[PDB]
Design an enzyme around this catalytic site. Structure first.
Site, mmCIF file in Angstrom:
data_model
loop_
_atom_site.group_PDB
_atom_site.id
_atom_site.type_symbol
_atom_site.label_atom_id
_atom_site.label_comp_id
_atom_site.label_asym_id
_atom_site.label_seq_id
_atom_site.Cartn_x
_atom_site.Cartn_y
_atom_site.Cartn_z
ATOM 1 N N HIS A 39 0.840 -1.177 0.000
ATOM 2 C CA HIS A 39 0.000 0.000 0.000
ATOM 3 C C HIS A 39 0.882 1.236 0.000
ATOM 4 O O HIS A 39 2.046 1.220 0.437
ATOM 5 C CB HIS A 39 -0.905 0.046 1.246
ATOM 6 C CG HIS A 39 -1.677 -1.212 1.495
ATOM 7 N ND1 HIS A 39 -2.719 -1.627 0.687
ATOM 8 C CD2 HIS A 39 -1.533 -2.169 2.443
ATOM 9 C CE1 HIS A 39 -3.204 -2.762 1.154
ATOM 10 N NE2 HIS A 39 -2.504 -3.113 2.223
ATOM 11 N N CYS A 89 -4.958 4.899 -1.343
ATOM 12 C CA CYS A 89 -3.897 3.981 -1.717
ATOM 13 C C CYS A 89 -3.956 3.829 -3.255
ATOM 14 O O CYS A 89 -4.994 3.445 -3.793
ATOM 15 C CB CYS A 89 -4.095 2.631 -1.030
ATOM 16 S SG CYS A 89 -2.977 1.437 -1.674
ATOM 17 N N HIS A 92 -4.916 0.455 -4.889
ATOM 18 C CA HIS A 92 -6.248 0.014 -4.486
ATOM 19 C C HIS A 92 -7.312 1.098 -4.519
ATOM 20 O O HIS A 92 -8.405 0.961 -3.924
ATOM 21 C CB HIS A 92 -6.157 -0.616 -3.093
ATOM 22 C CG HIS A 92 -5.257 -1.804 -3.054
ATOM 23 N ND1 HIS A 92 -4.241 -1.927 -2.144
ATOM 24 C CD2 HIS A 92 -5.200 -2.907 -3.841
ATOM 25 C CE1 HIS A 92 -3.591 -3.058 -2.365
ATOM 26 N NE2 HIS A 92 -4.152 -3.673 -3.389
HETATM 27 CU CU LIG Z 1 -3.561 -0.467 -0.804
#
Ligand SMILES: [Cu+2]
Ligand SMILES: [Mg+2]
Length: 105
Positions: A39, A89, A92
């Site tokens: 991340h 992030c 993501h």
């Molecule tokens: Cu992430």
């Protein structure tokens, strides 16, 4: 006070846990790499006070964090304006891995 935010939910979801934190100037937010790394932490320049790319860049940890348990901290000094700070992030972001810090002066 230091407030801890987990990167990745304990159960294995692409989330910051908790998603929203409220702090006072002088407080620290500590991100701990929790599940499903890597991340990173990117502040949205459109959703920090003053809409400043410079402020967003200063706060961000753009490099990916891979090690379980590794951390990144911001202490919200007086330089940093009160208001809301939204971040995400990068890998993501589409999965909804987004969070918000509210600095209440
Ligand atoms: Cu992430
Ligand atoms: Mg409160």
């Amino acid at each position: 006070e230091t407030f801890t935010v987990k990167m990745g939910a304990d159960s294995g979801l692409f989330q910051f846990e908790p998603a929203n934190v409220t702090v006072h100037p002088g407080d620290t937010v500590k991100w701990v790499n929790n599940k499903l790394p890597p991340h990173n932490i990117l502040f949205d320049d459109k959703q920090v006070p003053g809409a400043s790319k410079e402020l967003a860049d200063k706060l961000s940890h753009s490099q990916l964090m891979f090690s379980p348990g590794e951390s990144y901290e911001i202490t919200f000094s007086s330089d940093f304006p009160a208001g809301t700070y939204t971040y995400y992030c990068a890998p993501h972001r589409g999965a909804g891995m987004v969070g918000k810090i509210t600095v209440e002066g």
